[PDB]
Amino acid sequence: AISKNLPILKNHFRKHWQERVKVHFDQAGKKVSRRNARATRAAKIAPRPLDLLRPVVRAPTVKYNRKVRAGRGFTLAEVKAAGLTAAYARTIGIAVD
Amino acid sequence: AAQKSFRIKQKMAKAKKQNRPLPQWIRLRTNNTIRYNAKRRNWRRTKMNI
Amino acid sequence: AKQSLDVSSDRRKARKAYFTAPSSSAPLSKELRAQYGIKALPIRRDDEVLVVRGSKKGQEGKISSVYRLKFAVQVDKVTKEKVNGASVPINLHPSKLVITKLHLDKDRKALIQRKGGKLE
Amino acid sequence: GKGTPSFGKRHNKSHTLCNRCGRRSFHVQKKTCSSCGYPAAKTRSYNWGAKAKRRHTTGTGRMRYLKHVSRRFKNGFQTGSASKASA
Amino acid sequence: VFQVSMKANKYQIKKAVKELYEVDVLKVNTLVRPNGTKKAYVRLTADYDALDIANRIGYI
Amino acid sequence: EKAGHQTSAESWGTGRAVARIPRVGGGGTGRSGQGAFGNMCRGGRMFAPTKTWRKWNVKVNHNEKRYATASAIAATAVASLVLARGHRVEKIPEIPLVVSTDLESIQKTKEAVAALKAVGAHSDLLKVLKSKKLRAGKGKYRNRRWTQRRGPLVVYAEDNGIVKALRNVPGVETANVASLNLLQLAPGAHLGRFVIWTEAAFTKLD
Amino acid sequence: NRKRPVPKGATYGKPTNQGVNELKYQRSLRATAEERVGRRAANLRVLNSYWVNQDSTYKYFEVILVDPQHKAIRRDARYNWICDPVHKHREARGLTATGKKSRGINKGHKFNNTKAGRRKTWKRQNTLSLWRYRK
Amino acid sequence: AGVKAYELRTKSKEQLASQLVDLKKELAELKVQKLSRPSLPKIKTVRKSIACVLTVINEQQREAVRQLYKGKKYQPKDLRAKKTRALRRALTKFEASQVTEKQRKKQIAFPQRKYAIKA
RNA sequence: AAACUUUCAACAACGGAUCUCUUGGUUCUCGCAUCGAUGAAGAACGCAGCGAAAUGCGAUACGUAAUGUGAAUUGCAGAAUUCCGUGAAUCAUCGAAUCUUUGAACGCACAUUGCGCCCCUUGGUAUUCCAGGGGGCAUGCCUGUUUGAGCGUCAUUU
RNA sequence: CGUGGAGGUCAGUGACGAAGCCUAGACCGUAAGGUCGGGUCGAACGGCCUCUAGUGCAGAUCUUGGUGGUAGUAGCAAAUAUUCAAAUGAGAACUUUGAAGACUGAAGUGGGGAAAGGUUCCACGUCAACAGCAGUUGGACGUGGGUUAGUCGAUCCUAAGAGAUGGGGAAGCUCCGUUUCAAAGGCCUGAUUUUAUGCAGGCCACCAUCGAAAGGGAAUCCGGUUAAGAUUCCGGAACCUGG
RNA sequence: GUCGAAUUUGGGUAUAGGGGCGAAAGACUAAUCGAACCAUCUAGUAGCUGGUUCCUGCCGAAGUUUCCCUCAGGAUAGCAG
RNA sequence: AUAUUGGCGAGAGACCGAUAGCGAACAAGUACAGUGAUGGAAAGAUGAAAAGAACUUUGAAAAGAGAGUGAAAAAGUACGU
RNA sequence: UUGACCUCAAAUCAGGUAGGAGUACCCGCUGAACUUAAGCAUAUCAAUAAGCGGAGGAAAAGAAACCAACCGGGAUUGC
């Protein structure tokens, strides 16, 4: 068993870990397969910008305060401030949270 | 077994038809790899088991 | 080199598609390619053909029957005689052959122009 | 004698041909085929036996319907007749 | 003697033969051959004989 | 993973004057009573069967990877290293070799090959088309049947059709300045390659 | 309660799982109500259920079912989703109100063992993912 | 060469029925003389003729049955196209495409518009 | 000294190793979503001029109908000339049919190729007997229709 | 040092001939091994700089296959049995026929069957294989023929028992019971003259199905006839059931 | 030894795995049973036997300390590269 | 957006090369064993093309010796080396 | 006596649907032991394998009775 001067390793390989092993040989193959999905979307989505526009919103918690990230939607106060109604942003391609 | 049943007899009639060697023409066919009847069945060495 | 993603370059499939293939190839002579503007045509049972490669080089004849099991044709006159007195035809592969006279009824009358020919 | 002299006292039949699979596994007294199950409404196939399942799955028979299903979908399940193109 | 169909019975034998060969049947005796076929003995009445009937259809 | 283990065998133990390896059951087939499971047997599993999660690809430092490629680029110069891999350029005015950028806008292979032979790369082209031998290994019928030598390589800044004008002639390979594959600049881990530069590509190198 | 079907009380195991009479089953009697009713009439689809009455020996429920092969439900596209084949035997897979509660799928840190499926979350978190490039 | 395919298509219904017994009898004759000599390859070329005439009867007979049910619903099951079991079940294109009153009012009022960025 | 034993070489035997080939297996990757009461998966039995087996098929039986290609199949026999043309092909495609007895098995049964019932029609001097031919009779459940049952119970003349 | 494969190189070797194998022939290395000559043989292979691993053999009562000495040995010794002549055949202690001598001694070494076997039954031709000797002989080989039912049985009834409904359990595959908490059925008279079969009364209530080719059971025998069939076929003579 | 009976036996049926059945012997349960056969977990674990596949060059030991339900085993120190 | 040794259709490899690789490169879930659940192999390469041996002789034949075919039967079907 | 309501039924009433197969992925139920603990009873193996019910090309989850306490974020799913 253990002996000499080594750290006390705890390896969680006691179960039948071999029957569930998700190897990732595809990776690059899936990368091309997702370029195809992105490329074909750009055609049938009409000459549209694809991704919507997301708000500039401050990050939560203590450590993540110096940086500002992208949110999910422009609430309703900003939507009403812009003048356009709530459901018109979705048609024009603006996400609303 | 003398007092037989048609289900059994229909199987034996199938066995009689298939209890034959190869006709000679088979061996002369193009790209033939067959030389013997590997499914040969006899009443002494093996039993059908119906 | 191969560019499409639909044709194989593997030997196993390439040979498999050759031997285990259904029924459904000789070129033409210099005069025919200077008269019909076509290089190759399928072989038929009523074609005059001249041998260019092999031991029996130069002996011309007519195909007696295209035998698609051996993947070779049998020229009527080009044959070898057995010891006992009979004679059997020798298989000839159409790629080593040259057709000089055709047999065109309506279809070979049509295959010529589809392949950029001008017929007669 | 528990050996050779007792092997000549056996002339009866315990199992018989199964009307559903013909493997001679239809127990007479039990009236239940031991290979597939009959007249049960389901064919018995246990995951602890894998060779037995491999002997009776799809592909060991003729596939009188499924050899054409791939072909039928291969075009789109058309119906009707065909047209005349040329020649 | 004919190689009759397996599904047929002496009721369907006594009528099919008399419609093709226009001869009545005294009785029919039928056995199953051990080769997978069925055999049938058709005895016509005394008003006819099988000799000129067997050859007229071709077999004799 | 199921190879060799499909056969259900049990050890016969001791007392029967045979090896106590697992013997399969049943009878009347010639396989019954034979060995199984162990790698010493016939038809059993191989010792520690190879499994899919071996380390196939190995990571390399990005800076180190650029270092060897930069070293390989220096190996394209210096005449002595070039001749160490064949590369019959003994008759060449100077190394490196610089050609006009019009070679990029060549469309016909016949004119493309003639352009290389005019410079002096004919011997390198002539080195190929003579070494087309078979493969000694059993992989010659594993879609690796034929092998050749490596001819000159062409480096171009902007593609104008040269890639299709040289992709058919054996030995000649084309690569942009951006890619500059190390597998092409030093095959077999041997320094020195007869790389053909162009005016546009040689200026973009710096 | 759910008494084990073990014969004569024998469990044939460690002295840990030696109890037979004091196991409580893992689904509510409401789920069994849907199962025994959704199986008698296979031409229907189970929508929901609710408690109506009870006594010392039984628990009574009344199950509401929909017919997707009826032309009324085939039209009136408010309820077209019950006609989709993916909703075949919803209660058998625990997709009803009691099903989503018996297996405990809900939002919150109080549900982390079962938040996207107890088995799927286990397999997702108990597995070795090996990339091409071992970092 | 037995019989041809399209020549007997123009034949009447009664004439095709009498064509079977013409073929059916000569089969009974070919069996009688087949045993006489061990060669008779002509039986195959016309046993494929009895099948062709039988097939043409059904295609002509099914057409009359089909024409009777045109216009009305509830045609015989085998006349209905096979598809698969799943495709025959589920929702028709009308049933699937149907939408409720409220959602439709939203759709015409607020469709999804197309746009891009130029400046 | 022979016979005999042993070693080597030459040749010849038993034997199948070694080298080289594979109309195979294994793994990875890129796409698709198509079983079954319109009765499937599977099983039995039969079908080719001469075949047992594989393969295909279902007394329309190595299969019929349709389209395309276009002058064959082959071991032999035989059939051809249908081959300058709605025509060959153990061809390809396949959108129309046949699809035996079974099988979730569907009239009841089934280690007995057993026993039933209903409709149409034909024959047997026949609605009631028999036979032939054609078509039907499984269970749970949904909607609707039609017949009912219940001093559960409501109005109405008695 | 060597083995299977991968990158580069020697424009490396090669059907006027590669690889492989044999060779008390030669050379080099202490050795792992390498090189050459000869014979055999016909499609690929080698040196070097590196990479990779399912990489080395005498035995693990090691796996598979094959062959030895033993060895031409042990043995082919129970059931009281053989001999002569002819025929056939290249080839007779064994085949056939004839003549003797015996045995089973009719609780057969005889005639028929049940279960089981499945064409072993019979005919023609035939000996490479099996008949632990042999064999022109065969229950073997190749090709064919043969099983005829109103009366014989299965079909039908039920025994011990199995088991489907209505129901009650069980997450469930299914378990209990099978007449028990189920409103569970057809049936003769009459109506007739669209009533086809409905309708108006008399009615009875049994209450799935399976389960014993020696349990119960409607009815036939004789003569003769095949290479192989018969209470089945031919002839003659019967009886039962339904109408 | 017994032999017309708590006799012998055919066919159908019922009882099945820690379960059946036992005029009991831990007997029988289809050559296996004081505890059936088959498949899976399973390549079950072993401080215990056996084997563990090329050359040469250089160096080259131990059966001793302490602890352990430890004395046909480990850890620590030692010897060694 | 995620998984997918099952089904169909494809492209590949520093994989295995037929005592290996799937059990099966072959009439392979095949022969065969077991009353049963189940177990389950062996088997590739004559030659380019059968041209696979006319005919003479010996023998009863099987076959041998010639001849002949074929580059070569030291390639003759119990057939690469 | 007639005509409505509610409940329960009958038919080879009109029209429909469900059973089985495959399970590689997916949704649940039920559910061990070998083994590790250099003994063994919690534990680990394992909320696994076997057994059962259920679907699709994906299944599931999915627009918070959420995470956070931060200048708060904001359906679900996967790395």
Side-chain angles (χ1 to χ4, degrees), chain G residues 102-117:
Chain G
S102 288
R103 70 157 158 169
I105 48 154
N106 282 305
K107 295 196 184 188
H109 74 302
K110 297 325 196 88
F111 310 87
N112 286 340
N113 200 359
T114 80
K115 194 203 293 183

Side-chain angles (χ1 to χ4, degrees), chain C residues 74-119:
Chain C
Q74 304 173 343
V75 167
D76 186 74
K77 183 265 289 181
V78 176
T79 187
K80 194 262 291 183
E81 293 83 3
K82 260 178 84 151
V83 182
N84 68 25
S87 178
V88 298
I90 62 170
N91 289 300
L92 265 68
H93 187 273
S95 66
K96 305 290 169 275
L97 293 175
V98 159
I99 297 169
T100 182
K101 299 289 94 175
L102 289 83
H103 177 278
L104 72 165
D105 48 356
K106 278 181 180 170
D107 291 342
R108 289 212 162 155
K109 286 194 180 294
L111 274 73
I112 288 189
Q113 50 276 54
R114 307 193 318 167
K115 307 179 79 172
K118 46 195 169 183
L119 54 86

Side-chain angles (χ1 to χ4, degrees), chain G residues 16-72:
Chain G
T16 300
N17 43 41
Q18 263 163 349
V20 187
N21 268 336
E22 176 168 337
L23 305 191
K24 305 305 152 81
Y25 200 93
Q26 286 315 96
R27 282 156 76 70
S28 66
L29 292 188
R30 201 176 158 200
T32 305
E34 288 146 350
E35 292 266 37
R36 288 193 183 175
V37 165
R39 184 211 330 280
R40 161 179 201 82
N43 50 327
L44 297 171
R45 306 291 176 77
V46 182
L47 183 62
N48 274 319
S49 305
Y50 43 71
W51 178 85
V52 290
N53 207 343
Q54 85 179 6
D55 66 351
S56 81
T57 307
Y58 303 96
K59 251 190 171 180
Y60 303 82
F61 307 80
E62 275 188 337
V63 184
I64 57 188
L65 294 95
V66 191
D67 191 82
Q69 273 84 350
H70 199 288
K71 282 288 183 176

Side-chain angles (χ1 to χ4, degrees), chain C residues 8-16, chain F residues 140-141 143 145:
Chain C
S8 168
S9 305
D10 189 358
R11 203 215 186 89
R12 175 156 154 209
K13 303 166 186 180
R15 281 174 58 84
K16 160 72 165 295
Chain F
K140 76 190 296 179
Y141 49 109
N143 306 313
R145 196 169 174 86

Side-chain angles (χ1 to χ4, degrees), chain F residues 4-204:
Chain F
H5 288 297
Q6 294 145 314
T7 187
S8 315
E10 304 179 354
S11 170
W12 274 16
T14 191
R16 219 161 279 181
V18 287
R20 68 159 78 102
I21 58 152
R23 302 307 167 89
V24 302
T29 178
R31 176 63 183 266
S32 80
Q34 293 188 3
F37 285 123
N39 63 344
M40 65 184 73
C41 304
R42 172 174 180 276
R45 59 164 139 77
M46 61 155 298
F47 152 73
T50 45
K51 294 190 166 295
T52 79
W53 54 76
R54 307 171 78 261
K55 178 156 70 175
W56 301 106
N57 309 351
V58 289
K59 192 176 130 79
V60 185
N61 280 347
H62 205 85
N63 208 302
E64 212 178 59
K65 189 184 290 184
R66 302 173 150 144
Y67 185 73
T69 292
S71 181
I73 290 285
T76 53
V78 176
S80 54
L81 277 296
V82 179
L83 282 72
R85 295 179 66 251
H87 280 308
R88 267 91 163 166
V89 298
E90 293 83 3
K91 300 289 94 175
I92 282 298
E94 82 257 20
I95 295 296
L97 185 63
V98 184
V99 194
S100 180
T101 176
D102 291 331
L103 181 163
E104 293 171 345
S105 63
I106 281 286
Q107 279 66 239
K108 290 303 293 181
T109 310
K110 182 171 42 202
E111 189 60 35
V113 163
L116 275 73
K117 288 189 172 183
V119 178
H122 55 312
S123 297
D124 207 352
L125 269 298
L126 265 292
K127 170 163 75 74
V128 179
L129 284 71
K130 322 290 282 182
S131 66
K132 191 182 299 303
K133 313 292 195 77
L134 284 171
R135 187 176 290 283
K138 283 180 287 302
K140 76 190 296 179
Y141 49 109
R142 292 177 175 176
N143 306 313
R144 280 189 295 282
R145 196 169 174 86
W146 298 88
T147 181
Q148 288 73 241
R149 309 287 150 265
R150 208 75 64 101
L153 184 136
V154 177
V155 161
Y156 64 103
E158 271 66 3
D159 179 323
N160 279 321
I162 187 55
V163 296
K164 49 169 191 143
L166 285 175
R167 79 185 193 180
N168 190 196
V169 60
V172 186
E173 288 171 295
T174 48
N176 193 342
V177 191
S179 162
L180 274 179
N181 189 4
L182 182 142
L183 308 178
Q184 297 288 27
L185 298 151
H190 299 161
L191 313 171
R193 266 276 276 159
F194 189 39
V195 176
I196 286 165
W197 313 100
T198 68
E199 282 172 349
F202 194 80
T203 52
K204 198 187 173 181

Side-chain angles (χ1 to χ4, degrees), chain B residues 12-26:
Chain B
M12 293 182 286
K14 173 63 141 203
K16 192 157 191 168
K17 184 183 81 183
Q18 65 183 357
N19 182 9
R20 81 188 308 290
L22 279 74
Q24 183 66 41
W25 76 297
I26 308 195

Side-chain angles (χ1 to χ4, degrees), chain H residues 82-101:
Chain H
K82 168 58 85 169
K83 278 76 70 177
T84 61
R85 193 182 206 223
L87 299 183
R88 285 195 272 97
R89 282 134 193 63
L91 299 167
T92 82
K93 193 186 289 224
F94 161 77
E95 291 171 350
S97 59
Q98 183 193 5
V99 75
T100 194
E101 185 71 26

